């Protein structure tokens, strides 16, 4: 550690320092009487750290013998993760208090998970990748199971823990093979050794194990079956978190690994990523048709959308990475909007999650249904929504790389998936006899629905430089 190393990781130290101080403040000055105050200070902390990461002048570099990489790619990913995490906490604050779920440790656990994500996207070494991933994963298991009186929370944590641990073991086994072949954990050393003429079955086995281990975290098929059960079982605020911030961090990590460690064997891993993307797009679309629980529908929506994002990465190009980044940004915005509405659903003062509760909602609350309509067409990828332009970008990358067969399959699965988004619109606007679901939203939760919904249309006019920012970020990674 030099003073230059410490400066590079300063945003991470600031977040880590806050988490420790918040833990002591909550323990010694009121415990749950500070729970509401700690949640909102955490939201400010996430935004402050994002400002440190994203604002001012930045010069790309590395710290700690290359184990930590501070480049434009990692800065793009961190900002989206932190802002998405801040959004989920802010919009869920009222819901958790009403449901007697706001422990003063919940904001802190989320903060340490985000800290793990920040080390994931800036990994320049296999050990940094692992420690960042495991700090995030352990925090995610806890919040999945934090509704103690719910057998479904306990089962969600149990399934996530067991399958997450299995994927982590596979990731470690591949990481051990890669280290044995290359003689080092640093990616700059690894990339120089993994090249066309020297790929033994052993090192190719290592890549497969690492890829499969990571593809679990983005719910790629057939490493996806945890997602529907965990999404259903966990508290809806925790489900909203799983759907936005970890997926962005995990998707960026996969791009970091395949380009900074396996960037000279693109041909080998591009085919595997494409096969994952195909299976995820069709299963997510087909399985989503059979869902009656809205939370469980969003899991299959999540799986299908990660398949599309993987199409951009399967391209193996700077444009593919640029468009994968924009896709994840737009996907996170859409999920924040949708889960803001899902949190509000309730009948007789208790939360409700079944799709039939939406019948004729458009004639109960016109503005909220109109927002939900824009989000469903945005998730379906239909113009003029910003969700369409996300799909357009990854499809552009695929065709640009001579993978039109992947683009054709991608758009076909989109048609199947469009059915269950259309069905939600059908229920709200011309559905069957209504059972009195009401949407309870405070000011913050209300803006968590409207602003993402407005962004789906305003973004169609101007992306406000985000598309250009993603291109610069992709260049620093791919080179």
């Amino acid at each position: 550690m030099t003073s230059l190393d410490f400066s590079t990781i300063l945003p991470e130290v600031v977040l880590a320092g806050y988490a420790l101080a918040a833990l002591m403040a909550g323990a010694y000055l009121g415990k749950d009487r500070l729970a509401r105050t700690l949640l909102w200070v955490t939201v400010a902390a996430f935004l402050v750290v994002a400002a440190m990461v994203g604002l001012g002048n930045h010069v790309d570099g590395a710290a700690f013998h290359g184990m930590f990489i501070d480049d434009g790619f990692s800065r793009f990913a961190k900002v989206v993760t932190l802002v998405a995490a801040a959004g989920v906490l802010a919009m869920s604050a009222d819901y958790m208090q009403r449901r007697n779920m706001l422990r003063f440790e919940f904001p802190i656990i989320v903060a340490l998970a985000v800290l793990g994500m920040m080390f994931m996207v800036s990994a320049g070494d296999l050990l940094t990748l692992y420690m960042g991933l495991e700090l995030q994963s352990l925090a995610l298991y806890v919040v999945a199971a934090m509704r103690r009186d719910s057998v479904r929370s306990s089962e969600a944590g149990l399934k996530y823990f067991v399958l997450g641990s299995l994927s982590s073991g596979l990731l470690l086994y591949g990481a051990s093979l890669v280290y044995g072949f290359a003689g080092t954990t640093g990616f700059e050393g690894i990339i120089s050794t993994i090249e066309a003429g020297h790929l033994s079955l052993g090192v190719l086995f290592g890549l497969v194990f690492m890829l499969v281990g990571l593809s679990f975290k983005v719910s790629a098929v057939p490493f996806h079956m945890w997602t529907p059960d965990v999404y259903e079982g966990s508290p809806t605020p925790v489900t909203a978190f799983f759907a936005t911030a970890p997926k962005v961090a995990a998707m960026a990590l996969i791009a970091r690994l395949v380009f900074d460690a396996f960037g000279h064997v693109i041909g080998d891993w591009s085919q595997i990523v494409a096969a994952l993307a195909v299976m995820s797009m069709f299963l997510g679309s087909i399985a989503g048709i059979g869902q009656t629980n809205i939370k469980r529908l969003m899991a299959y929506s999540s799986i299908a959308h990660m398949g599309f994002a993987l199409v951009g990465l399967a391209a193996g190009t700077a444009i593919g990475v640029q468009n994968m980044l924009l896709y994840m940004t737009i996907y996170a915005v859409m999920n924040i909007g949708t889960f803001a509405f899902i949190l509000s659903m309730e009948r007789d003062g208790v939360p409700v999650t079944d799709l039939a509760a939406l019948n004729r909602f458009a004639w109960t609350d016109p503005v909220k249904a109109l927002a939900m309509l824009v989000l469903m067409f945005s998730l379906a990828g239909v113009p003029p929504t910003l969700g369409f332009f996300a799909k357009f970008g990854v499809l552009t990358a695929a065709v640009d790389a001579g993978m039109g067969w992947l683009a054709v399959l991608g758009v076909i699965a989109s048609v199947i998936g469009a059915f269950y988004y259309l069905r939600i619109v059908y229920y709200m606007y011309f559905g069957g006899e209504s059972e009195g679901m009401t949407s309870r939203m405070g000011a913050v939760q209300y803006l968590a629905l409207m602003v993402p919904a407005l962004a789906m249309l305003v973004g169609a006019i101007s992306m406000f430089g985000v598309d250009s920012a993603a291109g610069r970020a992709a260049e620093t990674l791919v080179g």
Binding site: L158, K159, V162, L163, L166, S167, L170, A196, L199, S200, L201, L204, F205, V208, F209, V212, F216, P222, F223, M225, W226, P228, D229, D268, I272, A275, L283, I286, A287, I289, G290, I416
Partner: protein, 50 residues
């Protein structure tokens, strides 16, 4: 008959298979992950070392 047979006969039939495979049993989900790795390893082996 063809259009409805595909849109309303086939795709729902594939939906029911997908729902069935999501059995809810933890050991089945782990089996799927192991089948995925084993299948991918078979794919890598056929391409060979190179």
């Amino acid at each position: 008959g063809t259009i409805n047979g595909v849109a309303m006969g086939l795709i729902p039939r594939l939906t029911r298979a997908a729902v069935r495979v999501q059995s809810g049993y933890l050991f089945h989900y782990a089996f799927a992950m192991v089948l995925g790795i084993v299948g991918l390893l078979i794919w890598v082996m056929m391409r060979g070392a190179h």
